[PDB]
């Protein structure tokens, strides 16, 4: 219908875009003594203070951490672990996919042919000072060996206790296996 010159029907202003006008002291439907009382008795201030007080009588949100822990999910990503089969054999096969996808290049692996003719690791390290806890390593493994536990209570006094090796991971998986089974039984179908 309309032809436009350097413009459009979208860039045309909204119908009511022009704000009406600032009101003055006249055209004020609130008498001077009313707003004077609100000015001198600090109404909205008392209201805010009362909204503060009602919180004084309400239940606090705080929990006592070492005796009551906060919510944790099967998808949670904390400390690392290397799992085993029910047979007692380890699941790692040195596919070195965890070593490749890891953003931080924390992982360091070195394999060789085991005495029984199988593929297995002799070195598996994680620098938890390089780890960002992304979970790409529990996603790539096609045997569900490496996992990330819900554990978060593994602080130390030294930086060399955080250069986890294979033995420290295999024991961590022997320890947390029951927790890992819960998380896996309720996370695997979506993963």
């Amino acid at each position: 219908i309309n032809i436009y010159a350097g413009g459009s029907a979208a860039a045309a202003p909204p119908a009511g875009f022009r704000i009406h006008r600032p009101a003055t002291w006249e055209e004020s439907e609130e008498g001077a003594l009313s707003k004077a009382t609100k000015y001198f008795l600090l109404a909205e201030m008392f209201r805010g203070l009362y909204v503060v007080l009602e919180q004084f009588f309400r239940a606090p949100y705080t929990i006592y951490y070492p005796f009551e822990k906060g919510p944790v999910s099967p998808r949670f990503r904390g400390e690392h672990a290397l799992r085993r089969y029910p047979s007692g054999e380890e699941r790692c096969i040195a596919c070195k996919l965890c070593e490749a996808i890891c953003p931080a290049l924390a992982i360091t692996i070195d394999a060789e042919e085991r005495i029984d003719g199988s593929r297995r690791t002799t070195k598996y390290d994680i620098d938890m000072t390089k780890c960002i806890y992304c979970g790409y390593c529990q996603e790539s493994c096609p045997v569900d060996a490496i996992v990330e536990t819900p554990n978060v209570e593994y602080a130390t006094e030294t930086r060399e206790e955080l250069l986890y090796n294979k033995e420290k991971l295999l024991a961590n998986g022997d320890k947390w296996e029951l927790e890992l089974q819960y998380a896996l039984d309720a996370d695997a179908p979506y993963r």
Partner: protein
């Protein structure tokens, strides 16, 4: 009312008051509609995420 409230308390899923304390709260509240904000323990996060039945029937969509 509009499509965006206000809504009463017995439809909000918060832990409220019971008995004479509710009458007192609705008296002493700037807006009695408002909630304490503490979730209701039987409902919120129940059953726990690691015990959902729906994970056994789940299949890749």
């Amino acid at each position: 009312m509009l499509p965006g409230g206000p809504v009463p308390v017995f439809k909000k899923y918060t832990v409220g008051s019971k008995g004479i304390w509710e009458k007192l709260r609705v008296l002493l509240a700037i807006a009695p509609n408002r909630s304490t904000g503490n979730p209701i323990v039987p409902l919120y996060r129940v059953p726990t995420p690691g015990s959902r039945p729906e994970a056994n029937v789940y299949q890749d969509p």
